Design a protein around this ligand. Sequence first.
Ligand SMILES: [Mn+2]
Ligand SMILES: [Mn+2]
Lengths: 288, 76
Amino acid sequence: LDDIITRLLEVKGKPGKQVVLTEAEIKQLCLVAKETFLRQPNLLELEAPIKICGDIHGQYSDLLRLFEYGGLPPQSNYLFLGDYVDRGKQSLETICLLLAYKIKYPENFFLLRGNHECASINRIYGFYDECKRRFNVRLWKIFTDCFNCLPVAALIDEKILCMHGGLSPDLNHLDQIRGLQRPTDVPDAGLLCDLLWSDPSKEVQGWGMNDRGVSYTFGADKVTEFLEKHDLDLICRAHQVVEDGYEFFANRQLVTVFSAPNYCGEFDNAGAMMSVDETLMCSFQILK
Amino acid sequence: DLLGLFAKSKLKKMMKSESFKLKRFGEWDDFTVGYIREKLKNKYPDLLLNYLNVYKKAGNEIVRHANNPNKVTFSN
Ligand SMILES: [Mn+2]
Ligand SMILES: [Mn+2]
């Protein structure tokens, strides 16, 4: 309903620290975005050029900085790697805008599921409370139903594999991501869990138990083997705050992109976005 | 009144006996790692990582070919 959707974008395109939308509007974004996610596959097959952002964590004003740098949709294509909500002050503005652009430019704008797009997590780490306090808890369940449909990985020109978290001991072929059943919660263990939860480790070779308490660490050995086996050049993931906004692993066979600058007003990290051009030359735009 | 493959009695024996362990790992191969981890119930992580890192061997089998001739590079 293209008139409603542009007024919504227009209004969100403004700074503040108060609501500007109705519950029914937010409900609409969640319904329509959900249907859009379910039309498109769970493993996205995207083409460059495209701009790739990592965690935002409700840092709405920084999200606007990122669209400044990259160009508002559809001046560029975007893939976000999840973690839109939690920790920041403005999760609602953050997710509502992102969902609006998904609905608006569905062939040009993409969002993956982060481990925080999960009820048992965002219950605890702020989103549920932001929902209750600015609207109500019913709007939280509406987001949950929407998040449960978020796609889980994306493959760029068949050479860059993107997911929020990392590799899985159960990720033997990429079509297994395509086959993940969508309206789902994140199970405690297994492929979907690991795609949203796993981390690269410089210290631990192979598979290690993840200190977070779910899923795994993978060493540079696992990355090397995985890229060779699946004829991929790069893994692009997020999930971890990194000082310089991006950070290479395993001879640059993987990169972590985290887009929330100065996370929680505490980390003093830079945020990054990775631009992939048509030749798959990758470059990084930094926010301090 | 049998035991499951992942009975605690068997996991302990696997900790104590390399040959027994190898035999059970033989059967653990019939399951996903997700399945196995849920069965281990957050005990015997040493068994699971040994299974994952030592007993399981990775290929060098290439199982995919990408039809894109481009190759990732990094800018200056
Ligand atoms: Mn994370
Ligand atoms: Mn995070």
